[PDB]
Write a protein that binds this ligand. Structure first.
Ligand SMILES: Nc1ncnc2c1ncn2[C@@H]1O[C@H](COP(=O)(O)OP(=O)(O)OP(=O)(O)O)[C@@H](O)[C@H]1O
Ligand SMILES: [Mg+2]
Lengths: 223, 267
């Protein structure tokens, strides 16, 4: 699908300011947050997975966690990544999402067909899972996300289905701090309301702090 | 009347061999003593050790294992003859003496999962756990009717066509006389047989992990009906057969299978 595309993107790459151009092109509707946009660009382009022999798997996915107080456009960042990225699926820590983190097997409500409904972690095997409200997830959701992040696999042992299916997604998560206001006095681990094993599997941890800064407020209001 | 066999060579040979095996008097009277013990205990089901049967006559053992109904009928005829010879009054008291099997079944010993269609019409010893049981119902094996209008007393017999072709004629319960005289059944004089249906499921500790369990339906009759209750780790030795479908006109080729138990054992 890329012929004149591939003709021109090489020239854009040689432009020699392509990195800054991309970092500025991410989230054109979100003001500021240059660091967040840069991290999201790095996550979008991803890394290089590798596995010395067949025994030392190392992921090539750059996981991102935006922990921030309300009114900081974390949801807008996730929605923009949904819009841009291919194979991008948006799930929420609440129960009000079309898909869910945990995989199950049941007869579909519409198709009336016995289906192995794999989770939103598996529906983005080679894409991005946008987990909003990452701090408000059930015990099963937390265990599922732990399994996906640490193993990149999801194991079902449900009815007679004993399977292990791959979910090699890049996780972009949005979370709020304990009390609804990030406090730098404490550390990120005890600010975020998440388990340390869960936090560890994130490459980028964007602390989206909100402060009453005259110029920033004026510019954001203008936007 | 109808067709009546005169010279069934296979049936005669089977009866002769089974009676020779049951003689046992020279062979340290093991089965002679067993027959005497069941006579004294007032039982009408002989449990035979298939290992001893194979040792005596491997041919008969193989024939019995691979052809269940015919050889079991021959064995029951031989057992009834032996019971009459030892004591005639008891033989006349009990119409049919049943034979159940026991011992080491080389390949026939299976579970509800490994029990495939390759074992139809064979003797299979299936282990499992009783998932459910049914109420013990009486099936009429010989009904007696009295006609007040004529004082006549008729007796109808119904054969055990559980796994055999059955026609409406055999399973019609008389309700009138040839002259349309209402009948009245003599329940006391009638002969009933207790019948029960259980379900044997593969033992969870034996079933492959993570899979759904495999079940089988078992039919128990007189003197075996209440040998087990739900949750019993039972060994059922029986004959695996296809249950006839209802008179159709179009058949899908699908046949429910079932195990006619000839013996039930607990741990
Ligand atoms: N930096 C920004 N530039 C432009 N609009 C912004 C910015 N931050 C927030 N907004 C707008 O302000 C409102 C708040 O954003 P949004 O609803 O995404 O909040 P949020 O970070 O998801 O909050 P919460 O975590 O409380 O759900 C929205 O209208 C969003 O468009
Ligand atoms: Mg939000």
């Amino acid at each position: 699908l890329t012929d004149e595309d591939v003709k021109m993107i090489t020239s854009l790459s040689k432009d020699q300011q392509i990195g800054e151009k991309i970092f500025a092109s991410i989230a054109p509707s979100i003001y500021g947050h240059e660091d967040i946009k840069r991290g999201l660009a790095l996550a979008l382009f991803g890394g290089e997975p590798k596995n010395p022999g067949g025994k030392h798997k190392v992921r090539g996915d750059i996981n991102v966690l935006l922990c921030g107080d309300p009114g900081t456009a974390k949801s807008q960042f996730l929605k923009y990544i949904e819009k841009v990225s291919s194979r991008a699926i948006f799930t929420t820590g609440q129960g009000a999402s079309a898909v869910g983190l945990t995989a199950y097997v049941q007869r579909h409500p519409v198709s009336r067909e016995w289906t192995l409904e794999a989770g939103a972690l598996v529906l983005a095997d080679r894409g991005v899972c946008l987990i909003d409200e990452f701090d408000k997830m059930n015990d099963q959701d937390r265990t599922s996300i732990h399994e996906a992040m640490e193993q990149q696999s999801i194991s079902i042992s449900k009815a007679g289905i004993v399977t292990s299916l791959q979910a090699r997604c890049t996780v972009i998560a949005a979370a709020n701090p304990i009390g609804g206001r990030y406090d730098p006095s404490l550390t990120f681990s005890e600010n975020v309301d998440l388990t340390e094993p869960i936090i560890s599997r994130f490459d980028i941890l964007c602390v989206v702090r909100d402060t009453v800064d005259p110029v920033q407020d004026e510019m954001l209001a203008r936007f | 009347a109808g067709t009546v066999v005169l010279d069934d060579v296979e049936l005669r040979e089977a009866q002769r061999d089974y009676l020779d095996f049951l003689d046992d008097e020279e062979d340290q009277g093991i089965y002679q003593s067993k027959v005497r013990e069941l006579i004294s205990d007032n039982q009408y089901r002989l449990i035979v050790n298939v290992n001893d049967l194979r040792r005596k006559n491997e041919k008969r053992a193989n024939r019995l294992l691979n052809n269940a109904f015919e050889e079991l009928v021959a064995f029951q005829r031989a057992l009834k003859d032996f019971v009459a010879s030892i004591d005639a009054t008891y033989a006349k008291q009990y119409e049919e003496f049943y034979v159940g099997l026991e011992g080491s079944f080389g390949s026939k010993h299976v579970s509800p999962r490994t029990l495939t269609s390759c074992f139809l019409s064979c003797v299979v010893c299936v282990e499992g756990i009783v998932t459910k049981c049914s109420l013990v119902r009486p099936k009429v094996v010989r009904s007696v009717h009295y006609c007040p209008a004529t004082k006549k007393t008729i007796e109808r017999r119904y054969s055990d066509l559980t796994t055999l072709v059955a026609f409406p004629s055999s399973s019609v319960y008389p309700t009138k006389d040839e002259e349309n005289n209402p009948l009245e059944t003599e329940y006391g004089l009638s002969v009933y047989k207790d019948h029960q249906t259980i379900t044997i499921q593969e033992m969870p500790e034996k079933a492959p992990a993570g899979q759904l369990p495999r079940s089988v339906d078992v039919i128990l009759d007189d003197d075996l009906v209440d040998k087990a209750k739900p949750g019993d780790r039972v060994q059922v030795v029986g004959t695996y057969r296809c249950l006839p479908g209802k008179k159709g006109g179009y058949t899908s080729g699908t046949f429910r299978t079932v195990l006619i138990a000839c013996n039930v054992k607990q741990m």
